[PDB]
């Protein structure tokens, strides 16, 4: 499955001018566009090589939309203070996420249109794309406003309509970057612990996409018992990295195998120390 998602944030800062407003857009999970109100000459800007192909009317159009959205979030931050009876001196955050998951058959899988205030769920469009889930009483007010205003149907028209169609466009125009694969380069480090045994750490570097399996074996049987791990984490260049470690007895290292499974490999990588 593929996706086009937009992550949006407005943060208030009373006494330091208007709220900071930011937009980021992703295809699958890769950043390609961004808008930041604290930039010099704030405009929608490319963040990936393949989107630069778009003509000037694309960037003028998206900059107009972002500036329109920034104004709405200014009102929403002021409204939020009333709904929760909060003083107007504090910093508050409002977050928005909207986009579409589609399959290869071009079919919408899921559509998202959800908000959070000060880091907690506020209102979310349900999977039917017709009803709203409202967290607290304050969000139920909003739900009533949006119910009588037909909000769901207008917003659904973006989710089933423009979102799906531009994702197809982005997937063809960015195909060589988005659907590429980069294989993992793996190695193993060896560190004697103070207790005399040895930490073996298996690294996988520079792979794309992010999904990967990293396991330790002992002549054939996996070792999820004493296996330390980090979550997959990003590099600047758009690739990822991961490691898993086990503790083994000194001098018996060559009995342990690290296994790496990834799209960019035809067959799994086996390696030992």
């Amino acid at each position: 499955s593929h996706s086009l998602r937009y992550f949006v944030t407005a943060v208030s800062r009373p006494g330091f001018g208007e709220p900071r407003y930011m937009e980021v857009g992703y295809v699958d999970n890769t950043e390609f566009v961004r808008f930041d109100s604290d930039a010099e000459n704030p405009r929608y800007e490319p963040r990936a090589r393949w989107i630069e192909q778009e003509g000037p009317e694309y960037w003028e159009r998206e900059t107009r939309r972002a500036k329109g959205n920034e104004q709405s979030f200014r009102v929403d931050l002021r409204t939020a203070l009333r709904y929760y009876n909060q003083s107007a001196g504090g910093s508050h955050t409002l977050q928005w996420m909207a986009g579409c998951d589609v399959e290869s058959d071009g079919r919408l899988l899921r559509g998202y249109w959800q908000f959070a205030y000060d880091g907690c769920d506020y209102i979310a469009l349900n999977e039917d794309l017709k009803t709203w889930t409202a967290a607290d009483m304050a969000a139920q007010i909003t739900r009533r406003k949006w119910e009588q205003a037909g909000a769901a149907e207008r917003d659904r028209a973006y989710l089933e309509g423009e979102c799906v169609e531009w994702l197809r466009r982005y997937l063809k125009n960015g195909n060589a970057t988005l659907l590429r694969t980069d294989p993992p380069k793996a190695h193993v480090t060896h560190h004697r612990r103070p207790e005399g045994d040895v930490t073996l750490r298996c690294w996988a570097l520079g792979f794309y996409p992010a999904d990967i399996t990293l396991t330790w074996q002992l002549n054939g049987e996996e070792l999820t018992q004493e296996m330390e791990l980090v979550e997959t984490r990003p590099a600047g260049d758009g690739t990822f990295q991961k490691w898993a470690s086990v503790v083994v007895p000194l001098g018996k290292e060559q009995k342990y195998t690290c296994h790496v499974e990834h799209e960019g490999l035809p067959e799994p990588l086996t390696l030992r120390w």
Binding site: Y6, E23, G25, V33, R61, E62, R65, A66, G68, N69, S72, F73, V75, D76, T79, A80, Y83, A98, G99, W113, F115, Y122, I123, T142, K145, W146, A149, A151, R154, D155, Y158, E162, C163, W166
Partner: peptide, 9 residues
């Protein structure tokens, strides 16, 4: 193309 706000909270 991104989404556009048309309703207020």
């Amino acid at each position: 193309i991104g989404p556009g706000r048309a309703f207020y909270v």
